[PDB]
Design a protein around this ligand. Structure first.
Ligand SMILES: N[C@@H](CC(=O)O)C(=O)O
Ligand SMILES: [Mg+2]
Ligand SMILES: [Mg+2]
Ligand SMILES: [Mg+2]
Ligand SMILES: [Mg+2]
Ligand SMILES: [Mg+2]
Ligand SMILES: [Mg+2]
Ligand SMILES: [Mg+2]
Ligand SMILES: [Mg+2]
Ligand SMILES: [Mg+2]
Ligand SMILES: [Mg+2]
Ligand SMILES: [Mg+2]
Ligand SMILES: [Mg+2]
Ligand SMILES: [Mg+2]
Ligand SMILES: [Mg+2]
Ligand SMILES: [Mg+2]
Ligand SMILES: [Mg+2]
Ligand SMILES: [Mg+2]
Ligand SMILES: [Mg+2]
Ligand SMILES: [Mg+2]
Ligand SMILES: [Mg+2]
Lengths: 70, 66, 153, 116
RNA sequence: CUUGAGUCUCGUAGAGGGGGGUAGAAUUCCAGGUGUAGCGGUGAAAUGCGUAGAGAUCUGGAGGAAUACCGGUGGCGAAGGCGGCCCCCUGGACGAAGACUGACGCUCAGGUGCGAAAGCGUGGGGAGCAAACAGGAUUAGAUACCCUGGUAGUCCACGCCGUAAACGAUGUCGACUUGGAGGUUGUGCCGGCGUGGCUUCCGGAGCUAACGCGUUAAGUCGACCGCCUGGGGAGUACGGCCGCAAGGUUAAAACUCAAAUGAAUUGACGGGGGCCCGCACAAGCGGUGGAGCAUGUGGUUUAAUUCGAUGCAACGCGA
C-alpha cells in the first residue's frame, strides 16, 4: 500500500487514506492469519463452517421478512 | 457485475493484453475476486492464468513492493 | 447503582459567608452529626487563615483548594489477573470534594494542638504547596501520569 | 553532523514493541528509538502511546541532521503503526509517502498455535 | 434384434498422474555498510541474544521448503488425495450428430493392485517447523499447558509398512416416485425458451426409535457381496500367515455384570452466550479482628456443671 501525500491535503485525510488503503488490501488481516501454523484439517473446517453460517444467515434474514414481531 | 468477457465474445484472454489485464489486478497487483468484478468462473480461471503468464514475463508485477 | 434514579440533595449555604462551597467543607469535617461543633472549627481556622494571609475569608480558602484539586485520577480495571490502573479525568464536582477530603484527612494527622489550629496550619501549607494535602495531589498525578499509556478501556 | 533534509522513517511495530529508525534515502540509519527504551516495560511497552513517545524521542535524537521531508515505511502488525506516524507529523516533519512494507510470504511454516 | 454394454469421428472443462525446467514474496544464515543500547518474550517474567556492537535499516550472496491474491459448502480422481507458471509423456469424464458390434452385462469368496500421517532401511539434503531433550517460568507438585533453544523427522530417490473419526460413521449396480433455490461444465433454437453431466441447500409423500433422509433416499423394488447377534474380558491370549522391526491380519475361552447402549424430554449445572436486578461490586462513612469488661457457645473440669439450637438460615438463640 503506497500512499503519496498530495498538495493542499492535510495530514489527517492523508493518514486516513492510508487507513483505507491498508484495510482494502487487508495487510493486517493476513498478518494475523500467518502468525501461527493452521493445519489443513482446520482450514477446511473453518472454510466449510464459514460458508454454512453465511447461508444460514441468508435463510434467517429471508424468513424473518415474512414474519412480524408485533 | 456484468462479466465483460461474455459480452465481448472472447475465447482466450490473451495475457499479452496487459491493458485488459490491469483492470483485474489491485493497486498492489493482487488479482481481484470474481465476486467483485462479476466475472464468470470460467473466464476468471483464464484471467488468473493469464495474469501469471504476464507476471513471469515482467509485463505485470507481483506486488507494489518490488 | 444499576438503576441511576439519583437526584442531588440541596445543601444550605453556610451561616456566615453564604457559600455552599464552605458548607460542604463543614459536612466533610463533621463527625457524629455535630454540625455546630464543626462550624466553630471551620470558622475559627478561617478567622486565623484570613489574618495570616490578609487575603480574605473565602478566597484564602479558595487558593488552598486550587493547589489540592486533582485533575486526573486512576481507577483500577482488571483485564487478565494483573490490575491495570486507568487514568481518568475527574469531573468538576468531584474535584472540589477530593480536595476537601484530602485537606481534612491531612489535618487530622498533625501534631498541632486544636483542630482549628490543625486545619489552619494545613490550609496555609496548601497555599504554598508544603502540606501533605498537596502531597497527595502530586501522588495522584504521578500515578495517573505513570499509567498514561492505559488511557483507554 | 551531516545535513540530509530528506530521510525515511522505518517503523517496526510488532505486537510486543515498536522501533523507530530514521534513515537517509540510501538506508544508512541516523538515529533510533524504541518503546522499551523509552521508559516502558511489559504491558505499557505494547501500547500505542509508547509508540508515540518513541517517535518523539527519535525525532528528538536526529534533530542534529536537519531533516525536513520524511518518507514513512510501516512494517509490522503492532498497535504503534498509526500513533508513530502521527507523532512524526506533529513533531514537525513533512510526511511525503506513507508505505506499508509488511513482509507477506507468497514460504516457511509458521510456529504452532498456542494452547492457552 | 437393439433399448443394457462397448467402439469410432468432433470438441469442452478440470489442483487427475508421472518426468523435467523456471519465477517471485518471505524466513534463515554468510560478508559488508550506517548506527547505538537495548532486543526478544510473556498474563507477568525469566531463560536467551547484545557494547566482542545486537535489534532496526541497506547492499551482495548461499540455500531449502511452500506456492499469498485468484479461491469459491469451486474442480478433478476408485479411494487415499491433488494448488505458482511452462514443456514432455499419459489416464479418465462429459456433450452433439450419426455410423458400428450385437447381451459382449451386473456382482464378486479366494487372488491381485492402489492406499493419509506417523514409522522403518539405504543414499542424499536440511531454510522454517518440531516429537525426544535442555533450561526459564507456572504450580502444592508440573515428567504438561506458556517461553527460550532444539535432535530425529518433515524434503528427494528407491524399497518396505498397510493402518486412520481411511467418515457421507451410509457396499456396488439397475429401475421407478411431488417441488423450490443455487453452483459448475456442455449443447439446440430464438437476454428468453429447451436439453444433458456433476454438485450444494430447503423441503413433500413415504420411511425412521427419534434425530433426520427425502429423485445424489435412510422412499418403492431387484441382483450379488461384506458384516452383526448383550457389556466387559478383547480385537486380547495362543496358533498360522505377513513384516527388517514397529507390528498388521485371522481370532478365542475361562471368568464377570444385569445391564451396556441409541435418540429425544424435564430439570440442574457450565471456569458457555445474551439481556436484567440486589449495599453485589465500585464511590464513601463507621465498624469488627488488637485492649478491658458484659454475654452466648465450644472445650476442659465437675458430684452436677439440666435439656435444646449448633454452615448462610446455631452462638445477647428457647431464656
Ligand atoms: N506463502 C504461501 C506458500 C509459502 O509460504 C502460502 O501461504 O501458501
Ligand atoms: Mg512464539
Ligand atoms: Mg477408449
Ligand atoms: Mg466389480
Ligand atoms: Mg476381498
Ligand atoms: Mg511420510
Ligand atoms: Mg527415512
Ligand atoms: Mg538417512
Ligand atoms: Mg516449544
Ligand atoms: Mg479399520
Ligand atoms: Mg479422510
Ligand atoms: Mg469428511
Ligand atoms: Mg467402518
Ligand atoms: Mg432435506
Ligand atoms: Mg493382535
Ligand atoms: Mg498373532
Ligand atoms: Mg466498596
Ligand atoms: Mg476484642
Ligand atoms: Mg449447653
Ligand atoms: Mg430432646
Ligand atoms: Mg446437640
Amino acid at each position: 500500500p503506497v500512499i503519496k501525500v498530495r498538495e493542499n491535503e492535510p495530514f489527517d485525510v492523508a493518514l486516513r487514506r492510508f487507513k483505507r488503503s491498508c484495510e482494502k488490501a487487508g495487510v493486517l488481516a493476513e498478518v494475523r492469519r500467518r502468525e501461527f501454523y493452521e493445519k489443513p484439517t482446520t482450514e477446511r473446517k473453518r472454510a466449510k463452517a464459514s460458508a454454512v453460517k453465511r447461508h444460514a444467515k441468508k435463510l434467517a434474514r429471508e424468513n424473518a421478512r415474512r414474519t412480524r414481531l408485533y | 457485475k456484468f462479466c465483460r468477457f461474455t459480452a465481448e465474445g472472447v475465447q482466450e484472454i490473451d495475457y499479452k493484453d496487459i491493458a485488459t489485464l490491469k483492470n483485474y489486478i489491485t493497486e498492489s497487483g493482487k488479482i481481484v475476486p470474481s465476486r467483485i468484478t462479476g466475472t464468470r468462473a470460467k473466464y476468471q480461471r483464464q484471467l488468473a492464468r493469464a495474469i501469471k503468464r504476464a507476471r513471469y514475463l515482467s509485463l505485470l508485477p507481483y506486488t507494489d513492493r518490488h | 447503582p444499576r438503576r441511576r434514579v439519583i437526584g442531588q440533595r440541596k445543601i444550605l449555604p453556610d451561616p456566615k459567608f453564604g457559600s455552599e462551597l464552605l458548607a460542604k467543607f463543614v459536612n466533610i469535617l463533621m463527625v457524629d452529626g455535630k454540625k455546630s461543633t464543626a462550624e466553630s472549627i471551620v470558622y475559627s481556622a478561617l478567622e486565623t487563615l484570613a489574618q495570616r494571609s490578609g487575603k480574605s475569608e473565602l478566597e484564602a480558602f479558595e487558593v488552598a483548594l486550587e493547589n489540592v484539586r486533582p485533575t486526573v485520577e486512576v481507577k483500577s480495571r482488571r483485564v487478565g489477573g494483573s490490575t491495570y490502573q486507568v487514568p481518568v479525568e475527574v469531573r468538576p464536582v468531584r474535584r472540589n470534594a477530593l480536595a476537601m477530603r484530602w485537606i481534612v484527612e491531612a489535618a487530622r494527622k498533625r501534631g498541632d494542638k486544636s483542630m482549628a489550629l490543625r486545619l489552619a496550619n494545613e490550609l496555609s501549607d496548601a497555599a504554598e504547596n508544603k502540606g501533605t494535602a498537596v502531597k497527595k495531589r502530586e501522588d495522584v498525578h504521578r500515578m495517573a501520569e505513570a499509567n498514561k499509556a492505559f488511557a483507554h478501556y | 553532523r551531516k545535513q540530509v533534509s530528506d530521510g525515511v522513517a522505518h517503523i517496526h511495530a510488532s505486537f510486543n514493541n515498536t522501533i523507530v529508525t530514521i534513515t537517509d534515502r540510501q538506508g544508512n540509519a541516523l538515529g533510533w528509538a524504541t518503546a522499551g527504551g523509552s521508559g516502558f516495560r511489559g504491558s505499557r511497552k505494547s501500547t500505542p502511546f509508547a509508540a508515540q513517545v518513541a517517535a518523539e524521542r527519535c525525532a528528538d535524537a536526529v534533530k542534529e541532521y536537519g531533516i525536513k521531508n520524511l518518507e514513512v515505511m510501516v512494517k509490522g502488525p503492532g498497535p504503534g503503526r498509526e500513533s508513530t506516524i502521527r507523532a512524526l507529523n506533529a513533531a514537525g516533519f513533512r510526511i511525503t509517502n506513507i508505505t506499508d512494507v509488511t513482509p507477506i510470504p507468497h514460504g516457511c511454516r509458521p510456529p504452532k498455535k498456542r494452547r492457552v
